[PDB]
Structure 1
Amino acid sequence: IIQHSIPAVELRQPFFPTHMGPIKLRQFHRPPLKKYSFGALSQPGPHSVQPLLKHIKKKAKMREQERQASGGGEMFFMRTPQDLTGKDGDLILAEYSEENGPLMMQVGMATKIKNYYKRKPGKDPGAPDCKYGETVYCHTSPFLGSLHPGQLLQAFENNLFRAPIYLHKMPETDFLIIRTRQGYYIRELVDIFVVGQQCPLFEVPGPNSKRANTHIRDFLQVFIYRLFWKSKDRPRRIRMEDIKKAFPSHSESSIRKRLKLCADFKRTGMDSNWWVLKSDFRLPTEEEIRAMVSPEQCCAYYSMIAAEQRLKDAGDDEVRTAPWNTTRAFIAAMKGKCLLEVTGVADPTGCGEGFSYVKIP
């Protein structure tokens, strides 16, 4: 039901990285402010910020013209990477309560806001109306607790998790500066949600698991197919050190295993030192490559390797708080396999607030 952007479902590297080193796994979802080497901001000195208000309303008027030219229904707009800029559209902010959640969305992925509203016993006026999201009447509480009669609770709902969100107004002093290579741009923000403890809907694999190694192999295969699609020479041909630049932790035996079927190495003559595509091999279409790896599997893999790094840096309680254990515990509790001790050490708050997702019989 969730439709991510075309950069997200095609697993583009800027948004979905092929390899994350140790210093990039410690700064997972906390990207530092990088210094530019070339560009207008790379030259040291004062730099004017630029107010985008004409850009926002011009883009919104243009998208409304596109929607009314296409029959007036609901449209799909996020088709390019330049659609995912912060320079246009209605931005909200979303703050997280936990430090490191078990699952977290990459850039370019979609989520929905669902307003769960339990009616009052007998007569009820109607859901308190809310600016964002669609309202749904929940007799059966989605979360661990149950809604009170007449209580509306907003929540982020996607394929990765489901988490209760709470709308707060922004501080009166804070603005949002979008810096690029060319200059600074400023928006105001008015809406900021606080996201509670996530209820995971996707199971993060463990390290060295079968699902883990399957995702690594399928991700490498999808990258190899998309490099073959990008090739301009007729017998489509790629170079090995492009793949070695993308996946540098991989042993080259695994890369040659992926290239063994679907390609062959030409040493001499034309196409020398290239891996040309086999003439009998039909390169898979775009929808087959999309059906190979899902973006949520990439987010689960990134959560696993980030938690692997954090545990590795910190020398059994911590192992229980690892997202493969907690996601398995919560999904098993949702099928009714087992129960969870709601007070424990997997508690991301460290106090009595919040749950702990570890299995109890």
Structure 2
Amino acid sequence: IIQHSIPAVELRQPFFPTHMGPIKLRQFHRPPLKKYSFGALSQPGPHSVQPLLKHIKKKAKMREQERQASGGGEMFFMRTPQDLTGKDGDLILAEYSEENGPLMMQVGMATKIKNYYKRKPGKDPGAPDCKYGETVYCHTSPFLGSLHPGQLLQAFENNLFRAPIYLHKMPETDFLIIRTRQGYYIRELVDIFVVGQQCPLFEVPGPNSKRANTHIRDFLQVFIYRLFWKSKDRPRRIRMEDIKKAFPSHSESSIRKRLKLCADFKRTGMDSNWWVLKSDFRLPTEEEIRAMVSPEQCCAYYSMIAAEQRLKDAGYGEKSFKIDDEVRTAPWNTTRAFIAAMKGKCLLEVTGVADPTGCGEGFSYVKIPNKSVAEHQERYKEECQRIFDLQNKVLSSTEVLSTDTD
């Protein structure tokens, strides 16, 4: 059970962008430092980097007191955008080995760490302890390969994906800088996980699929309801211009569709007119709005449009998505293939063009039929096992390489 932060659950901006142009899609999950137009750090010259130690201790203390003040047990702390800052709480880094994994979290979403352990035969004294995560004793593997007896494997686990992770040490040279309009802050950060290839648990839709089109529609609908809720006017009213600015690729006519059932156009002598909430229309509750569209569904959709943009950039037209190698790497194909195989509907290529590492240390998620048929499945498991073990060994290794001069 995953409980996201309130800003994420509410699909607030900027945590959940309403629109992304080509540039943003290319930079998806890699935001570049952009200059500020105003505020302290818009100014030239040196700026102080501030310590956070007193602040970190204080917030931990305040949070624990709030915990004891009601009057123990479990509390949920991620209620406001302010609670999501890197400025307090314990922090880890996670570095993703896939250049563009099929699903990624937005800021404000939650994930668990699970410590998968397989018992040694006979008298097992229990799993080793880890600094992070909750131990899970598993007789069957949640991955493509099987755990060996006595093997502990850490992993990220959420509704988008499961992925093995490997704990490493941050280099002694490195610090985390947090940057706001107001100043820089610095934190020590020692724990950094390498993330291995994802096992997708959520299916990414194809471009212009019914699923994709239903999603943008519903997301637009949610944004609209939230606009009415934000309005302080009685009767509530919103401006077309504000919707168009958030959804610049929607025609005014398609936006009028979403508005015709809940609102009335009020014309004024000025090129700004209002849509006023109908007096017999009951605005959906917070709880009902949340049920309309989940953060996971937004993540699936984002994955599609970003991939679609990268494909266009590489010369692959919409008619391409009998199929080109590059199109096989698309998240709508890889997630579909992996999930089908998880349900026993087919097997996976494993060795193939969709291996995200390009060098045999990752899996190619491409459907092959279940179609000597005990040898067919034993060969699939053997190959899965080999790559599974290879990935764990390479990504957990502390060996120092050796810059490639090419």
* TM-score category of the 2 structures, normalised to the smaller one: over 0.9
1:272 Cα offset (Å):
7.9
Say whether 1:179 aligns with 2:179.
yes
The DSSP-based 3-state class of the residue aligned with 2:166 is strand
The DSSP-based 3-state class of the residue aligned with 2:341 is helix
Q: Residues 243 and 62 of structure 1: is their aligned pair in 2 closer, same or farther, counting only changes over 3 Å?
A: same
Q: Separation in 2 of the partners of 1:336 and 1:65?
A: 49
1:271 Cα offset (Å):
13
Q: Residues 163 and 243 of structure 1: is their aligned pair in 2 closer, same or farther, counting only changes over 3 Å?
A: same
Q: Separation in 2 of the partners of 1:273 and 1:249?
A: 20
The total of aligned residue pairs comes to 360
Structure 1 unpaired stretches of 5+: none
Identity %: 100
1:252 Cα offset (Å):
1.2
Superposition map of 1:44-83 within 5 A = 44-83=44-83
1:121 Cα offset (Å):
1.0
Superposed CA RMSD in Å reads 1.2
Conserved 8 A contact 1:266-1:272: no
Conserved 8 A contact 1:103-1:161: yes
Say whether 1:253 aligns with 2:253.
yes
Conserved 8 A contact 2:239-2:272: no
Q: Separation in 2 of the partners of 1:95 and 1:341?
A: 26
Q: Separation in 1 of the partners of 2:44 and 2:331?
A: 43
Q: Separation in 2 of the partners of 1:197 and 1:272?
A: 50
Q: Separation in 2 of the partners of 1:39 and 1:277?
A: 38
Structure 2 unpaired stretches of 5+: 315-323, 370-406
Higher helix share: 2
Q: Separation in 1 of the partners of 2:171 and 2:206?
A: 40
1:71 Cα offset (Å):
1.5
1:270 Cα offset (Å):
12
The DSSP-based 3-state class of the residue aligned with 1:192 is strand
1:24 Cα offset (Å):
0.5
Q: Deviations over 1:175-225 (max 9, x none)?
A: 000010111100011100000000000000000000000000000000000
Q: Residues 238 and 157 of structure 1: is their aligned pair in 2 closer, same or farther, counting only changes over 3 Å?
A: same
Conserved 8 A contact 1:113-1:154: yes
1:169 Cα offset (Å):
1.0
1:269 Cα offset (Å):
8.9
1:268 Cα offset (Å):
4.6
The DSSP-based 3-state class of the residue aligned with 2:364 is coil
Q: Residues 249 and 16 of structure 1: is their aligned pair in 2 closer, same or farther, counting only changes over 3 Å?
A: same
Conserved 8 A contact 1:348-1:354: yes
The DSSP-based 3-state class of the residue aligned with 1:358 is strand
Conserved 8 A contact 2:215-2:297: yes
Q: Separation in 2 of the partners of 1:105 and 1:268?
A: 43
Q: Residues 28 and 120 of structure 1: is their aligned pair in 2 closer, same or farther, counting only changes over 3 Å?
A: same
1:266 Cα offset (Å):
1.1
Q: Deviations over 1:105-147 (max 9, x none)?
A: 0000000000011100111121010011110101110010000
Q: Deviations over 1:74-97 (max 9, x none)?
A: 100000000000000000000001
The DSSP-based 3-state class of the residue aligned with 2:162 is strand
Q: Deviations over 1:276-330 (max 9, x none)?
A: 011111100000000000000000000000000000000x101000000000000
Q: Deviations over 1:57-78 (max 9, x none)?
A: 0000000101111111010000
Q: Separation in 1 of the partners of 2:76 and 2:125?
A: 34
